[PDB]
Design a protein around this nucleic acid. Structure first.
Lengths: 92, 80, 94, 104, 285, 316, 94, 80, 94, 104
DNA sequence: CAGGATGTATGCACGTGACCCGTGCCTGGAGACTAGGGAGTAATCCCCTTGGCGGTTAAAACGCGGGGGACAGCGCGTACGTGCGTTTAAGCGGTGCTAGAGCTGTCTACGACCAATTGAGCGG
DNA sequence: CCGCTCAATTGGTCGTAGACAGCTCTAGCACCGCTTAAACGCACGTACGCGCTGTCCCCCGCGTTTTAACCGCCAAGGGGATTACTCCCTAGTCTCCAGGCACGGGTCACGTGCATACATCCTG
C-alpha cells in the first residue's frame, strides 16, 4: 500500500474554495509540501529534544520548532491553530 | 556517448536566459553556460548514482534525483 | 522590422508566463547518460528521473541568469558577460 | 471516534502520530504532539490552497495547477521565505522584468 | 595562595642552581675555573665531559681474510688490515691511498661502483658481492674475493671484509652426522638461461654472477647428464611440483666440473596464471 | 619608512637564549643510563650529576661496528659455555646461522646440540682445562687460556618435522673465570653462508608501503622501503614482486594472493624478502584492492609490509 | 605625508594578519541587550554567548565586505557603495 | 536600552572592512553596515532567545548562540 | 563530581604521531572537539537517511561508506574509505 | 581490550558506538559501523593536524593555535569545501588582496 | 690613549600564565549469553525502459545589415583620505550581592505495549 | 458505488522520563577608581567617481535551408517488486575492572625589571 494526503488536501481545498478543483500535478506538489514541512518540524523538534536531553516530543517542542521555522505571521497563526486543536482535542 | 553537451543549443540557452529576464546575451555566454550546466549535472548525477549504488539498483529513480537535490540544498516538489 | 530589444521583452514575458521545458528533451537525455556513464556503466533511467533533472536544471540556470542579469545591470551593462556569471557563482558559494 | 474529528481537523492524526514514531525522531511521542502538528500542517496547507485558488481565479481557471501554486507562493512574502529554496515542477516564474530593460 | 606559588618557583630556581653548580663540580675544567660559570657554559662543558678489549681479541683471533675501507666517490682505498698480505700479497702501503679500481678486474669494477652506490649497521646500507682482485704474486694475476660490508658516512665509504674462499670443500660431512651441504639458488628462463643467481653459486661454481646471468645452464651441464637434466627441464615446465634431479656434473670457471643435485619447479604467478620462471635450488654432492 | 620590530629583536633574542638552554638540557639528559620520558629538568640534572660520577668512576676503572662486520663476514657468533656445558651467552647472529634464538641456547646444555659421538671431545676440552690467574695478567691474554677446537652443532628449525640437521663449526676463544670457569669463543661455520636470514629487526617496529599491478608488478614504492630492502623505487618498478621472494615462500604467498583475489582484503603468511644487501628478511603483509569506479573491477593492489622477527614467525 | 591608499594597504595587511576582535566589546554587549530586550526583558547572558555572537557577526560582515569589494571591482570601482552591499546580499539570497 | 547601535564606530567599520580587503569606503556604508549588522544579529538572537525560552531558562547560553547559528548555516567552532 | 567526555586525549595522541615536536592550544583543542562532533552528526545523519530511503533498520559500514562518499570531496573520500576499510578488515580479522 | 586497539585505531570506538546507538539514528547499529566511522574521524583529524603542524613550523611556532587551523582549512581546497561555511574563533583570514588594490 | 657619561645587549631573578603528573575512582566500556526480529536468499512475475521504424515538421543552423552598446579617452570637482589636537569612554582591576544554573531525591502522570473491536479507507 | 479488511482507536497493565520541591554554589549583575588607546571633530589636498564624446564592431532580427526532434506504433526481456524460509546478528541483560577524567600539587615558558659589563664617544 501507498499513502498520500490527496483526500485531506482535497477536503481542505473545498473549505476555502468549494468552486475550485485540483490537478494531479498540483496534488503532487502539495504532497511534497506536506512531507517537507513534516520533515522540517519533526527534525527541528528532534534536535530541540536532544539539546534539552529530552527523549519525548511534546507540543512544546513542536510549538518551538514552528516559531523557529515559520515566518512571523505564519508562526502566530500556526501556533494559535495548534493551541486550539490541542485544547479542543483534549476537551473532546 | 560523447559531445551531447553541444545538444544544448544556443536558442535553448536564449530561452532560459529570457525566462531569467535577460535582455541581451554575449556569444561567450553559451559555452560558459554549457560548462556550468555540465558541472551541475555532474554534481546531481554523481549523488543520484551513489544512492543507486548503495541500494544495489541499476535503475535510477526520480527519488534518487530528489535525494541528491535535497542534500545539495535544493528541494524539488512533484516528483514523489 | 522591429528594433532590437522589443522582441526580447516579448520573449521574456512569453517564457516567464510559460511552464514547459525550454530545453530539448532527447539531447538532455543523451547528456545525462553521457555523464552518468562515467560513474557507472549499464545504467537505466526512469522517465520521471529525467523530468526531475530537467526541471531542476532549468530552475537552477534561470536563477543563475537572474543573478547574472543583476550583475550586468549593476555594472550598468545590458549585455551579460561570462564574468557576470562567474561573479554571481562565486558569491553564491560556487 | 476519530482523533482528527476531535481536533476539528481534516488531516489524519493517526498517520501523523505514526510518522512521528517512525523516522526515529524520538524514543517517545506525546499524545498532543501529532494533534498540534496536524493543525499546523493543515493550516499551512489551507493558506497555500486559498492563495492558489485565488491565482486560479485570476487566470480564469476552476482548477489548481502548479503554475498557480508557484505564483501564490512566490507572491506571498511569508510563503516565499518558507519555500524560497523550493522548486516547483511546471511552476514557471514570477513575471518580473527590470525597469532598466524597458524602452524610453 | 599566590605567595606559596611564587615561592615554589623560587624553590625550583634554587634547586636548579644547586644542581648546575653541583654538575659543574664534576667537570675538571669547571672545577679548575675560578670564576662562576654561566648556566649555559656549565652545561656545555658538562656534556663535553660525559670488556671491549677482551672482545677485540676474541673476534680478531677468529678473523679471516682482510678488512678494507673504500671511498664511494673515487674508489680510493682508505684502509686495509695487515692480513691482506696473506690474501692479495699486497702490503698496506701498496693498497692504501690507491684506487681499488686499480686492483679490481675490469668486469667487476662496474659492479663495485653500483655496490658502493647508496640506497648497529642497518641492512639497507649492507652490501655483498664477489669480485676479482689483483695479487702481488701472479689468469692467476687475480683471485676471487668475497666482499661483505656496510656503507658508512665526510667521504662516504664501504667498510667490508674481503675473504678468499677455497674452491675445494674441506672437511666432508661424516656419514654418522646429518650435516647441511653447501647450497645455492638460481632461477632460469624457459630455455634454461639464468635470470637470477646468488653469491653462493659463485662460491660453488667459481663463476661470478655476471658470468652466469644471460647464459644457459646447458652451457655448463656436462653432456653425460644433459639428457637426464633436459628430461627434468621438459617435465618441470609442465608442473608446479618439485622435481629432484640425480647427481650431475656442472662446469666451473676454472674449467673443471663439480657434482651437484638440484630441486626444480615452475613457479606460476596466480594473478596471471603464468609461469614466471624455473626456480632451482642446487646442492653440492 | 617607519621604524619597526625593535621589540621583536629583543624578544627574539631573549627567546633564543631560552632555546639554547633547552637544547643543552636535552643533550645532557640524552646520554644518561636509565633514560625515561617526562622527567623534570631538576631530575635530568640530578641524574646527569650521578651519571658523570658513575661515568668517571667506570671509565677510570676500565668496536661494535667492527665486531658486527667481522662476525657477519666470518659467518659466526660469540658463544660462551660453562665447564658443565651450560650456555651462558650467545650472539644474536647465531639465529641467522643456526636458527637458534638466544632463549633456545641460553641456560641449556651445549651437549643438547652437539652429536652424541662428539660429546666426549667437548667434555674433554672443558674438563681437562684448568687455570688460576694472577692479579696482573687478564685471562684472555694468556696463551694458556686460548683454545681452538672444532665440533658439530644442531640447527634449529621452524618446522620440527624436519630431520635433525647439524653444522660443523670452529671454536676460537679463551677460558675466563666468572663470579665457575666458562669458555668463550667466536664460533665460525666451516660451511660459508654467503646468504643468511635476518632474524631480529634492528628496530622494535618498521614498515614500508608498495602498490602492485594485477600482474603483481611494482607500480609504487615508498621512501621507507629502501632502508629496509636496499632497493630504490626505480630498481623495483615494473618488476614482479615475486622476484624478491624466497624459493619456499613463493608457493605460500601465491596461496595468500589467491585468497586476496577472492575477498579483496586480507593478511599474508610470513615470508622472506631478498634485500640488495643479500639478506633474507622476514615479512608479513596486509593487502587490500582498489577498484575502477566505472565497473567496480580491480585496478591495483595496495600493500602494507610489516617486518617481523624469526621468533614471531616460528610462534605461529 | 603618506600617499592615499598606502595606509589602507598597510591596514589591510595588518588586520588580515591579526585575529583580534575589531568591534568594541562593551558597546557590542549593550547592542545585544538592546535587541534582546525586544524579545524578552529581564534576560541574562553568558559572557561567552556574547563573544560567540560577536565573532559570528564580525566573520559575517567580513565575508560580506569581501563580496562587496568584488562587486565594486566588477563595476570597475574601488570605493564600496551600499548598492554593492545590497547586490551581494541579494545574490546570496539574504 | 537605546542607540547602542552607535557603539559600532566608523573606525570599527573601517577596520572590519580592511579585514575584508576593502581599500576605500563611501560614507553611506557606515549606516548601511549598522543596518545590516542589526538584522543579522537580531536574527541570531531571536533564535537563541527562542531556544532559551523553550529550555525554560532566564539565562542565554553560548550553546543557544551555537544552535541559532547552526540552523542558520553559520556553524561556529570554539564554543563547544 | 561530574565528568564530561572530550576528544582531547585522542586529538593529542594523533598529533604526537604526526608532529611530535608540536602541541595544541586550549582554543585549538576546543575547535577540534567542535569539528569532530560536527562531522559525526553529518555522517550519522546522512547514514540515517540512507537507511530510511532503503527501509533498513540497521546502520552498517555500507551506509557510512556511502555517507563518506557523499559528504567528502573525492580525494578525502578515497583515503577515508580505504582507512575505514582497513580498520574494519583488521578488526574483523582479529 | 578496546575495539580501537583491535582495529589499530586511536579513537574511542566504544564511545562512537554509544553515540551511534544513541541519538536515534537507527533502530540498530552494525558492530563494524563504529569502527569504520572512528577510522574516518581519525583520518580527517590527522589531515587537519598534519597541516596545522606545518603551519605552526612555517611561522616558527611549536604550538597550534586557531589561526593555524583556519589557515590549514582555507588553504586546503578539500577542507574548505567541507568546512567552507564554518566559522572559527580567532580564526583570522587568508591574506587576500586584490591586484587592483596593490601598487603597480 | 684615559676617564666619565650614555646606550646596547647579556644575563639572571622575579611571579604570573600555561601546563602536566599523580592520585583517586567510578562510570562506562568490554565479555558472556540469549531471543527472536531483520536481513539474506531463492523463485517468481510482468511493468517499464530500451530500442527500433517511419513520417511530419518546427526547430536549429547558417548568412547579412546595420543600428546600439561596450568601451577607451578626457576633464571636473568634490567626497573622501590623511594628519593633528582634544576628549571620552573602553579596559582593566578591583569590590559587593545574590538570582539563577545546576544537581538530588520523590513521586506522579504519562506513553509504550498488547488484546480487542470496529468502520474509514483502498481496489476495481 | 460495492466488498472486505485491518489501521485506527479503547481500555487496560506496566515501568519510568519528567515535573516538582529543595538546596548549593557560580557566574553574572552592579558599581567604583584610574589609564590612556581609541574615538571625534576639523583642516587641507587630490585620486576617484562621474559625466561626456566618439569610435567601431557585436549581437540581434529576419529570411531561408537543412536536421534531428516529436509523435506514434511496435516487441524483448530485465530488473524491480513480491512472497516464503532460514539463521544469525545485535538489543537487552548481568557482571567486572580499568581508562579516561577531575581535582591538587607541582613544574615550565613567558615578558619584564633589573643589575651589570661592554660598546662607544666627548673632550683633556
Amino acid at each position: 500500500r501507498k499513502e498520500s494526503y490527496s483526500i485531506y488536501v482535497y477536503k481542505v481545498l473545498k473549505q476555502v474554495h468549494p468552486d475550485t478543483g485540483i490537478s494531479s500535478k498540483a496534488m503532487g506538489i502539495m504532497n511534497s509540501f506536506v512531507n517537507d514541512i513534516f520533515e522540517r518540524i519533526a527534525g527541528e523538534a528532534s534536535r530541540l529534544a536532544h539539546y534539552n536531553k529530552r527523549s519525548t516530543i511534546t507540543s512544546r517542542e513542536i510549538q518551538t520548532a514552528v516559531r523557529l521555522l515559520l515566518p512571523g505571521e505564519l508562526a502566530k497563526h500556526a501556533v494559535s491553530e495548534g493551541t486550539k486543536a490541542v485544547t479542543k482535542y483534549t476537551s473532546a | 556517448l560523447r559531445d551531447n553537451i553541444q545538444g544544448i543549443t544556443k536558442p535553448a540557452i536564449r530561452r532560459l536566459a529570457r525566462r531569467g529576464g535577460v535582455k541581451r546575451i554575449s556569444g561567450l555566454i553559451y559555452e560558459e553556460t554549457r560548462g556550468v550546466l555540465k558541472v551541475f549535472l555532474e554534481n546531481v548525477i554523481r549523488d543520484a548514482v551513489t544512492y543507486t549504488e548503495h541500494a544495489k539498483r541499476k535503475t535510477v529513480t526520480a527519488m534518487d534525483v530528489v535525494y541528491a537535490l535535497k542534500r545539495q540544498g535544493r528541494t524539488l516538489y512533484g516528483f514523489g | 522590422r522591429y528594433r532590437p530589444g522589443t522582441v526580447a521583452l516579448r520573449e521574456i514575458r512569453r517564457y516567464q508566463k510559460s511552464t514547459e521545458l525550454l530545453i530539448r528533451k532527447l539531447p538532455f537525455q543523451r547528456l545525462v547518460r553521457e555523464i552518468a556513464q562515467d560513474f557507472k556503466t549499464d545504467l537505466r533511467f526512469q522517465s520521471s528521473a529525467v523530468m526531475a533533472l530537467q526541471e531542476a536544471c532549468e530552475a537552477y540556470l534561470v536563477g543563475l541568469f537572474e543573478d547574472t542579469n543583476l550583475c550586468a545591470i549593476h555594472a550598468k551593462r545590458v549585455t551579460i558577460m561570462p564574468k557576470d556569471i562567474q561573479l554571481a557563482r562565486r558569491i553564491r558559494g560556487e | 471516534k476519530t482523533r482528527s474529528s476531535r481536533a476539528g481537523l481534516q488531516f489524519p492524526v493517526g498517520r501523523v502520530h505514526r510518522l512521528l514514531r517512525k523516522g526515529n525522531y524520538s524514543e517517545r511521542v506525546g499524545a498532543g504532539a501529532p494533534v498540534y502538528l496536524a493543525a499546523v500542517l493543515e493550516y499551512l496547507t489551507a493558506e497555500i490552497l486559498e492563495l492558489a485558488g485565488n491565482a486560479a481565479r485570476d487566470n480564469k481557471k476552476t482548477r489548481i495547477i502548479p503554475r498557480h501554486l508557484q505564483l501564490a507562493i512566490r507572491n506571498d512574502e511569508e510563503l516565499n521565505k518558507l519555500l524560497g529554496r523550493v522548486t516547483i515542477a511546471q511552476g514557471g516564474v514570477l513575471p518580473n522584468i527590470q525597469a532598466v530593460l524597458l524602452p524610453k | 595562595a599566590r605567595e606559596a606559588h611564587s615561592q615554589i618557583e623560587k624553590r625550583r630556581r634554587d634547586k636548579m642552581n644547586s644542581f648546575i653548580d653541583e654538575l659543574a663540580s664534576l667537570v675538571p675544567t669547571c672545577n679548575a675555573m675560578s670564576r662562576k660559570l654561566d648556566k649555559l657554559t656549565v652545561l656545555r662543558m658538562a656534556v663535553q665531559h660525559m670488556s671491549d678489549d677482551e672482545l677485540k681479541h676474541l673476534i680478531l683471533r677468529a678473523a679471516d681474510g682482510f678488512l678494507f675501507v673504500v671511498g664511494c666517490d673515487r674508489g680510493k682505498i682508505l684502509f686495509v688490515s695487515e692480513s691482506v698480505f696473506k690474501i692479495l700479497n699486497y702490503s698496506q702501503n701498496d693498497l692504501i691511498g690507491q684506487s681499488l679500481f686499480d686492483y679490481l678486474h675490469p668486469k667487476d669494477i662496474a659492479k663495485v661502483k653500483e655496490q658502493l652506490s647508496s640506497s648497529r649497521l642497518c641492512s639497507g646500507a649492507r652490501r655483498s658481492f664477489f669480485c676479482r682482485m689483483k695479487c702481488n704474486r701472479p689468469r692467476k694475476s687475480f683471485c676471487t674475493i668475497h666482499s661483505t660490508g656496510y656503507l658508512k658516512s665526510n667521504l662516504s665509504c664501504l667498510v667490508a671484509i674481503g675473504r678468499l674462499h677455497s674452491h675445494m670443500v674441506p672437511q666432508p660431512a661424516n656419514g654418522e652426522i646429518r650435516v647441511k651441504s653447501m647450497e645455492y639458488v638460481s632461477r632460469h628462463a624457459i630455455d634454461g638461461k639464468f635470470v637470477f643467481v646468488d653469491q653462493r653459486a659463485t662460491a660453488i661454481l667459481a663463476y661470478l654472477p655476471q658470468e652466469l646471468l644471460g647464459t644457459s645452464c646447458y652451457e655448463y651441464f656436462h653432456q653425460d647428464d644433459i639428457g637426464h637434466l633436459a628430461e627434468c627441464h621438459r617435465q618441470v615446465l609442465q608442473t608446479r611440483e618439485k622435481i629432484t634431479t640425480n647427481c650431475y656434473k656442472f662446469k666451473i670457471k676454472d674449467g673443471s666440473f663439480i657434482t651437484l643435485r638440484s630441486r626444480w619447479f615452475s613457479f606460476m604467478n596466480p594473478w596471471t596464471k603464468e609461469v614466471e620462471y624455473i626456480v632451482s635450488t642446487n646442492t653440492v654432492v | 619608512d617607519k621604524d619597526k620590530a625593535k621589540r621583536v629583536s629583543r624578544n627574539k633574542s631573549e627567546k633564543k637564549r631560552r632555546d639554547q638552554f633547552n637544547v643543552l638540557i636535552k643533550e645532557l639528559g640524552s646520554m644518561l643510563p636509565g633514560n625515561a620520558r617526562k622527567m623534570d629538568k631538576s631530575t635530568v640534572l640530578q641524574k646527569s650529576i650521578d651519571f658523570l660520577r658513575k661515568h668517571k668512576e667506570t671509565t677510570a676503572q676500565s668496536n661494535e661496528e667492527f665486531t658486527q662486520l667481522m662476525l657477519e663476514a666470518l659467518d659466526g657468533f660469540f658463544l660462551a659455555i660453562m665447564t658443565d656445558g651450560s650456555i651462558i651467552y650467545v650472539s644474536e647472529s647465531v639465529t641467522s646461522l643456526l636458527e637458534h634464538l638466544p632463549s633456545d641456547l641460553v641456560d641449556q646444555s651445549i651437549f643438547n646440540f652437539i652429536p652424541e659421538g662428539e660429546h666426549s671431545e667437548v667434555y674433554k676440552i672443558l674438563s681437562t682445562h684448568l687455570l688460576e690467574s694472577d692479579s696482573l695478567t687478564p685471562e684472555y691474554l694468556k696463551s694458556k687460556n686460548q683454545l681452538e677446537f672444532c665440533c658439530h652443532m644442531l640447527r634449529g628449525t621452524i618446522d620440527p618435522k624436519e630431520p635433525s640437521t647439524y653444522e660443523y663449526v670452529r671454536f676460537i676463544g679463551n677460558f675466563k673465570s666468572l663470579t665457575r670457569v666458562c669458555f668463550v669463543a667466536t664460533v665460525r661455520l666451516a660451511t660459508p653462508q654467503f646468504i643468511k636470514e635476518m632474524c631480529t629487526v634492528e628496530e622494535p617496529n618498521e614498515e614500508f608501503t608498495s602498490r602492485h599491478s594485477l600482474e603483481w608488478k611494482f607500480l609504487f614504492l615508498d621512501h621507507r622501503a629502501p632502508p629496509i630492502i636496499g632497493y630504490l623505487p626505480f630498481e623495483v618498478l615494473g618488476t614482479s614482486g615475486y622476484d624478491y621472494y624466497h624459493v619456499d615462500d613463493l608457493e605460500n604467498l601465491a596461496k595468500c594472493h589467491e585468497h586476496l583475489m577472492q575477498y579483496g582484503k586480507g593478511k599474508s603468511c610470513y615470508y622472506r624478502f631478498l634485500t640488495k644487501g643479500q639478506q633474507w628478511i622476514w615479512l608479513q603483509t596486509h593487502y587490500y584492492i582498489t577498484y575502477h569506479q566505472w565497473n567496480s573491477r580491480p585496478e591495483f593492489i595496495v600493500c602494507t609490509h610489516t617486518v617481523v622477527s624469526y621468533a614471531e614467525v616460528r610462534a605461529e
